[model samples]
Target: MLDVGKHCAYCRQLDFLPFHCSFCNEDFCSNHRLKEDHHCRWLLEHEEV
Candidate 1:
């Protein structure tokens, strides 16, 4: 039995072993694991600062 507590931030899918984004502190599936793929909102918002 696997207990996946996080979901993909981009697609909203169940992620059994999601990848954590250090920039945004969010978890995402392999499909959206890349910073560009997820369109990391946090990274964009804080990049100027």
Candidate 2:
């Protein structure tokens, strides 16, 4: 029931984690999250705001 095309970000596995980014509100899982290097830019950006 998951569409995993890459490895998980948190777990770093080809499994399922459903990338949940509270900052960017993204759900890419671990594999896809690798694309962004698990960087919470949104949080950092809004930290001062």
Candidate 3:
């Protein structure tokens, strides 16, 4: 279950029940939950190189 108190990492808006990004480890509202929506860099940064 997700914590209802968390705000969207990108917009900083309350989602009432935000989504969690396993990749970025951040909470995001529905609008910004997608990887592209928030421009999540975790995928790139976490790459083994």
CA lDDT of each prediction against the hidden true structure: 0.81, 0.56, 0.78
* TM per prediction: 0.67, 0.34, 0.67
Name the regions of candidate 3 deviating beyond 4 angstroms.
Answer: 1-4, 43-49
**Cα lDDT, model 3, residue 22:** 89
Candidate 3's residue-wise lDDT over 1-49, tens digit each?
Answer: 6555778777888877677888778888888889877878965666574
Candidate order, TM-score descending: 3, 1, 2
Task: Give me candidate 1's TM-score against the actual structure.
Answer: 0.67
Question: Taking the tens digit of each residue's C-alpha lDDT, what string does model 2 give over 1-49?
Answer: 5464445445565645565666666555555564345666664566563
Give the candidates in order of lDDT, highest first. Answer: 1, 3, 2
Give the TM-score comparing model 3 with the true structure, all chains together: 0.67
- Candidate 2 Cα misplacement greater than 4 A, ranges: 1-15, 34-49
How many clashes show up per model?
0, 6, 0
Clashing pairs in 2: 6-31, 7-31, 8-30, 8-31, 9-30, 19-29
